[PDB]
């Protein structure tokens, strides 16, 4: 179909012009909520502390990449610290940094991992993955966090976004290197 592309109005076509059909599609796997609803490893704690910042997610992982594909987002959160450690503790967004959690929410370990559920605690209606605040581009606020955890020992930290909502899509780039080759190619799983 010819069209006046300048106006930017969407155009989506079948194969019917050429005599074709349309297959039945089931896009369950491209559902945003479903996609982000899994645990992603963000790394290890530091002095047995870790600020819960979704921007800590590895940017080439499925979750890190998708989260960054949106300008704004909202979600609740689940945490799981795996490692040999006794107890993970937590403080909400806006609390002063402490020397010891003592009395704030504390959860004891069970068979080497501590997993628990948290609520969105920011003071904003939604958070952003980018924020052009005083950083004049020429050709992230304190508040953007989900609290902080305190642990008894070093552990691997995993975050899981629950009830996720994304707004204003942003680019998602391929991360494999073509080298000089035209096609990309790798070894895919095959019977040995």
């Amino acid at each position: 179909t010819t069209s006046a592309g300048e106006g930017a109005d969407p155009v989506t076509t079948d194969a019917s012009a050429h005599g074709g059909d349309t297959r039945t599609t089931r896009r369950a796997h491209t559902d945003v909520t479903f996609l982000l609803d899994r645990f992603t490893l963000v790394g290890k704690t530091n002095d047995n502390k870790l600020v819960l910042d979704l921007l800590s997610t590895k940017e080439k992982s499925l979750v890190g990449a998708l989260l960054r594909a949106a300008t704004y987002y909202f979600s609740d959160l689940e945490v799981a610290c795996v490692g040999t450690n006794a107890w993970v503790g937590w403080t909400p967004n806006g609390s002063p940094v402490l020397t010891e959690v003592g009395d704030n929410p504390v959860v004891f370990s069970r068979r080497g991992t501590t997993r628990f559920a948290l609520p969105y605690t920011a003071p904003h209606r939604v958070l952003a993955t980018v924020y052009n605040g005083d950083c004049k581009y020429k050709p992230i606020p304190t508040t953007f966090n989900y609290g902080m955890i305190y642990t008894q020992a070093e552990v691997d930290v995993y975050l899981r976004m629950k009830r996720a909502e994304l707004y204003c899509p942003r680019p998602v780039l391929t991360h494999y290197d073509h080298n000089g080759r035209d096609r990309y190619k790798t070894t895919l799983v095959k019977p040995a």
């Binding site: 989506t12 079948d14 349309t22 599609t25 945003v32 300008t71 959860v107 628990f116 899509p169 391929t174």
Partner: protein
Amino acid sequence: GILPVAVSDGYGGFQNTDPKTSDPVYGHVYNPARTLYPGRFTNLLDVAEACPTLLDFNGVPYVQTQSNSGSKVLACFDLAFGHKNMKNTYMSGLAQYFAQYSGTLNLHFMYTGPTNNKAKYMVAYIPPGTHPLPETPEMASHCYHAEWDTGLNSTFTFTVPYFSAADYAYTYADEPEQASVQGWVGVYQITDTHEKDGAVIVTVSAGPDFEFRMPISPSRQ
């Protein structure tokens, strides 16, 4: 007495993609209203259908008449997300996270030449195993194709179909794969008034029945 219970081996270990929730620990928090917030998106394919992204032809998003060569081929590339022309597209961006796909694709061509410069183009889908990939409009006319000429409407949209032995194809290419298992798409210029180039911006979007399955975090090096 009390309820007898059998604890099972192999069940219970930490899981990263499990269908259950963690135990709560901090209640009664009411969020700020996020009513009517704009730009919400629900499925990657809705944005993928509506927003075409730029193909890359050695550094530029456009195909062109070009210099020396009596070659009518503006572009001919493997129908593959891993092809270098597809490298900077949202479709290839997303595809790196799924193992398989099925469905149609839409290629869009926007003509950029001045009012008095006229041309006539053609695009064809070349199936796998085709031998000497056609280099001429004449030969390529034997494939599923579309011819169109310039005029009042600058843009033309083409539907790259889905043919394969199987219902789904892979987004990645196995190391031992000499030819494109999915064939190629060739874009030719039948004729042009003026040899001074007229740039055609090429773009790609998901077709109405396109689909991805099997999310994968292909992570690293």
